[PDB]
Symmetry: D2
Subunit: 74 residues, 4 copies
């Protein structure tokens, strides 16, 4: 359900199942931010700005949370 | 017509008129905690902190909901 | 504790038990159109296409709601 | 001011003008899959199926977001 934007290709991208679960668990727990890793890369998702920050370079990639329709369609 | 109120007599969610829906939705978007509107000789207050509509003439309380559209939109 | 049902006897939204809230929310996140649960030896079905809980013994329909977290989060 | 686009140069989400926000939000509420708007003569298309704004003069694609207000509202 979480996505990050890639400015090189101009497209939204999905996280791995593990990183998506780490982000979503912190989101549901009321945390304002969450740290996660992808190989040698280290990131912080800042929920107050909806931005992923690369801890090493400071590169910012916007993030989004997909929303399910309420009510659900038949 | 994104706001609805539940009718326990029929067991269904009901839409508001375009005018009353707009009054409710403008107060919602403006950050107000409640909003009043009129319909059929009755004044109602929608309490956004509880998502309940109160009939100011009778005191009767009916629940309300805000419909949400999918993000992203489907093709 | 994100799902609620309206109780017209008390005039208030009511929380589900942690177990029933998890059962409902798991079906909601899986894309199901409905979910079954039990409470106090009674069987209920939540219909997500209408946002209504149906008492399987009496047929009584009560509305349900899903609480929504603000996006972005406040600091 | 509920819609935002991300400015990669400053690294911040940005609000639209009241007029462009209204154009975008009206198309969103009408169920349209995309909407065109202008900032002066500069042309843009917001694609709701991808949540991307396309600058129709440079071709640059910027992501967009819809802010969501908490339900129920806090007191
Ligand atoms: O007064 C009642 O008994 C039920 N009732 C209406 O007739 C009505 C009309 C427009 C908006 C809300 C309501 C509502 O709750
Ligand atoms: O059966 C009824 O009369 C009312 N009722 C309950 O006592 C109850 C308990 C837990 C979840 C839902 C319900 C519900 O609708
Ligand atoms: Cl970007
Ligand atoms: Cl990065
Ligand atoms: Cl009423
Ligand atoms: Cl329960
Ligand atoms: Cl019941
Ligand atoms: Cl540009």
């Amino acid at each position: 359900n979480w996505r990050w934007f890639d400015d090189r290709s101009g497209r939204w991208c999905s996280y791995s199942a593990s990183n998506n679960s780490t982000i979503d668990s912190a989101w549901k727990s009321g945390e304002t931010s969450v740290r996660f890793t992808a190989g040698r890369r280290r990131y912080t998702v800042q929920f107050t700005t909806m931005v992923q920050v690369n801890e090493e370079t400071g590169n910012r990639r916007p993030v989004m949370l997909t929303l399910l329709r309420v009510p659900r369609l038949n």
